[PDB]
Amino acid sequence: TEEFDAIKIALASPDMIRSWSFGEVKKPETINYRTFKPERDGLFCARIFGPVKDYECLCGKYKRLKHRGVICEKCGVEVTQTKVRRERMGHIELASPTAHIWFLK
Amino acid sequence: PFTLGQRWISDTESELGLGTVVAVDARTVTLLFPSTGENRLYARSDSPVTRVMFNPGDTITSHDGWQMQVEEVKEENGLLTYIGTRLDTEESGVALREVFLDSKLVFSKPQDRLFAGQIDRMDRFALRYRARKYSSEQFRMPYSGLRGQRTSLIPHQLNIAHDVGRRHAPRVLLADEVGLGKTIEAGMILHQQLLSGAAERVLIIVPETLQHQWLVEMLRRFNLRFALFDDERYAEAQHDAYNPFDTEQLVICSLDFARRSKQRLEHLCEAEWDLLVVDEAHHLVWSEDAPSREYQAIEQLAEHVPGVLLLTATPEQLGMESHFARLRLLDPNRFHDFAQFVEEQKNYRPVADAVAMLLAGNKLSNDELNMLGEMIGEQDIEPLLQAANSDSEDAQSARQELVSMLMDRHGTSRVLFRNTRNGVKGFPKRELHTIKLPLPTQYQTAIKVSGIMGARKSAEDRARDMLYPERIYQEFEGDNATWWNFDPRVEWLMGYLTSHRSQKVLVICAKAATALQLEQVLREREGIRAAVFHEGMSIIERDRAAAWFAEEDTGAQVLLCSEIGSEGRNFQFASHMVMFDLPFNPDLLEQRIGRLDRIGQAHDIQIHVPYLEKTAQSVLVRWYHEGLDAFEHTCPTGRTIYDSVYNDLINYLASPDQTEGFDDLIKNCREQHEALKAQLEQGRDRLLEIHSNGGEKAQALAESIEEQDDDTNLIAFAMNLFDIIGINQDDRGDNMIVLTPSDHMLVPDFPGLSEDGITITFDREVALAREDAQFITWEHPLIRNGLDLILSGDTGSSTISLLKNKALPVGTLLVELIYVVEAQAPKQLQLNRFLPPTPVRMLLDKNGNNLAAQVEFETFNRQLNAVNRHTGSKLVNAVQQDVHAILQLGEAQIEKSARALIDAARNEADEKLSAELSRLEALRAVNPNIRDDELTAIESNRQQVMESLDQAGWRLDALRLIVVTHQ
Amino acid sequence: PEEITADIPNVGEAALSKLDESGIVYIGAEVTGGDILVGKVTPKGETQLTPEEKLLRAIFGEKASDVKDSSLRVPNGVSGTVIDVQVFTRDGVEKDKRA
Ligand SMILES: [Zn+2]
């Protein structure tokens, strides 16, 4: 834990939002409801947000901890601890620039 | 800082060698590895990747194969170009772009990993050093191969294993009495030959009905996975190889399978087996003028395999002459004529008798003693001969020297071991308790109807039915009739159990159906916990029931169903047994009582036999106790008398009304018993039994193992090892750990582990009570596996640590250096008894003074702490010029310590190897069974050991940098 | 489909002792928190066992289909006597002993 102070708040610029995001969520599907593996692209996506289970890729080619930065060639999910799936944010590219309701109403 | 073209290595899988940056995106970088051609892309964050740059003094190799010497490297636009002198051409100023480096840059002796960025952890360095120390010390332990087997520490077993497992190409016939552990000694010898590296390929030929038993025995007791070869397997292995038997090191197969085709038996004989084991070799009948077609296939096999073990039985009170047919297979030239062996056994027989008088405490006439004098062809026998008999002060030691000399003169005892139940101590005594119960009228009424209606039916079937009243009460009172409500035996059982609730009781009944009915009735009318053990259950379920029965005080109070038994590890904690029924033939009776009457029990055995008045049970109790004395004593008279009395006694069972003639049948049975006992005790080759059971030295070995088996350091190292590797260890509590892998485990697959987990116990007694657990020792495959996995990998070989100590100068340098002394020799030679990979710790200072003799590892390590990845990374490179000068300081002392270790090891080697070669030479001068090949093998092994040891080297295994701070 | 059988992976026979062959507690049995209220098995798929492991499974009797337990247990810290049990099957389901 860092020793910090001064929490700063400001408008997020679109480039900063792109900076935080790890991937684009293109389709709204999440999971197959049949096999509970997440969608290859979706609101729950291993290749964007993180591996479901600690240190093992989705398709199951790489599962060992020896690998910590590799990104499985078949499934583009990196092998790390599932806790990261708690901090990684995504982003959506809107076709029409949209207003922020808070700053309007 | 990834830029296309840079060289990077993986900190963990350096077996991939160098890599090259070929792509970069916002979050990731891609390395090409020319060693294999694959690419791996990593996230920039947490960066588990290593910068590959070189320093002055390194030698590198170019993609064209030439090498050079780096003196300076420039960096521009993210790329490195190496400048230096090409040594093979002597050209100075040569440049090599980093993109053209070769891949064969493996994890060099850690003086090169100082500049690899993030370095490994300090607890894996601790595991690495502790692992090399423990493995080194344990390889040289005197009794290797004798502690990991899931058996009781029975002296004669450990003796047989010790003697045979250390021979070269052992060829022996095990003729131990039935039920003594023939297959256990066989498995121990196999465990030794496989663990010592003397053997790699093994073939066991077993009758099909026993194949699975062997598979489980070798797997659960000795941690050895054999591959069963049937026709289906044989075909699928024919596809995978020219010789199917080349795909697996350890193979089980049937003798009937072995004889199917001739091309099959020749492929088998060419598979280059190191050892061959055939159990129940007495089924191989052989005539000198007409050998059977069955014996011929083994005779063909035993000539193509150096070491060959034959397990057999010696029934019908005959001598080892019947064994010649098999001895001929071990050493065909030494044993080649029946008549000479007959002459030898007959002329030794009086000698054997006289010896039995000697050690029994008898005087030996001069006519007798001048036949042993003829055997031992010497002239100074007389003085030592008489002190043993006059009962002087050293009559015991003179008897022991006589017997020792006698064993060396026995014609077969070096190649033949026969332990008897009379020549081995440790078995518990057996006391009988009989209870006369009134036969309930419901049974009298149900059976008398079958009696009347049973007019024309043989007494054999009348007695086979009348034996078990429950299953004729199901024809007249209807099937499933609730007979468990009026049968007084059940009430007696309940009363005794409810009155002895703190005792585990083994209750034996005839059939599984009755056992299920008994569980149901004891539960629903007295709540007694009882596990059923019948043939219909699977191996895991029956194991589960044994597990429940093994719970000290919270588990099943009772057990048991039909014969099945066969549970290698026994209920050594159980000492009270009740026979709810009695078997027909005496062999099943003695085997059932055998399941408990084993070496290692808690106390003596109490046998309770509740039997119904005036039924076949009442007859059989009288027959077994007064007639055969089969309950309280174990003498194997039962089968002979049973065969000599069968047809007469049947009538006495099928009609207990005719009482006259019974008491005389009983006295006849006791007379036959006494005659058979006398003839057998007077046929005892007590010398062979004394040589077989190992005597006092063997009991001493067994107790040394019993004391080495309490090693708690083993458990404390194990937990650390697994936990570091990333194996979850749930402590169930009752001396059983459950190991399960984890998401953060360190290796792709563990050989033995499965995701469902395995249970282990470190206590030999728990293992003997819980066969579902792995008995973990220093020699257990799990530990040896993890050891090879760590000591071959390079994790734990390099780390840095800071020390905060007011009592030292700032910025001082301590350097822990772990050299490893190794020899290069084939494992078949068993060099590891004398020089395994041996660690050499040295704690150098800035002046090159060694403190290791003064500064133990643990104490120093306790007050040390690690750093963070980034600052530490170049904090290492802060002393790159210093550590290089520190290394040569120890370079001159490591050779001194090494030459001390090598000299001492080579000395220990020549003494023991010359003492054993001398013993074998004395034996060749004294025994005719030692082959030329044997002595040649030992001589060549001694020469090869001295040669490979004369070329032993050292290598840098581990390196930890220490820098003192006070921040 | 999940199963109600009494064969439940890696449970001691202590837990089964109070269960009948069908896998349901006996009426009138006294239970305590953590005791297994009824037996249920969770199915396992894509086991992909090694060929030697498959041979071991056949002799041992180990079930690739099970390896996980969905058995209901008495809630923690509640203890009483089972006075009644009911079983409701749909179409195409065999009646159990309790039924
Ligand atoms: Zn994958």
Curated annotation (Swiss-Prot), chain B:
Domain Helicase ATP-binding: 163-333
Binding site for ATP: D176, E177, V178, G179, L180, G181, K182, T183
Entry EC no(s): 3.6.4.-
Keyword tags: Activator, ATP-binding, DNA-binding, Helicase, Hydrolase, Nucleotide-binding, Transcription, Transcription regulation
Enzyme class: hydrolase
UniProt GO MF annotations: ATP binding; ATP hydrolysis activity; bacterial-type RNA polymerase core enzyme binding; chromatin binding; DNA binding; helicase activity; nucleic acid binding; nucleosome array spacer activity
UniProt-listed InterPro entries: Helicase_ATP-bd, Helicase_C-like, Helicase_RapA, P-loop_NTPase, RapA_C, SNF2-like_sf, SNF2/RAD54-like_C, SNF2_N
All residue ranges annotated as the Helicase C-terminal domain in the record: 489-661
The organism's place on the tree of life at top rank: Bacteria
GO biological process, one term: positive regulation of DNA-templated transcription
Gene Ontology annotations for the cellular component aspect, listed alphabetically: cytoplasm
Motif DEAH box, chain ranges: 279-282
HAMAP family assigned to the protein according to its UniProt record, in alphabetical order: Helicase_RapA
Record family assignment: Belongs to the SNF2/RAD54 helicase family. RapA subfamily.
Quaternary structure and partners: Interacts with the RNAP. Has a higher affinity for the core RNAP than for the holoenzyme. Its ATPase activity is stimulated by binding to RNAP.
Described function: Transcription regulator that activates transcription by stimulating RNA polymerase (RNAP) recycling in case of stress conditions such as supercoiled DNA or high salt concentrations. Probably acts by releasing the RNAP, when it is trapped or immobilized on tightly supercoiled DNA. Does not activate transcription on linear DNA. Probably not involved in DNA repair.
Protein name per the record: RNA polymerase-associated protein RapA
Organism in which the protein naturally occurs: Escherichia coli (strain K12)
Protein's gene: rapA
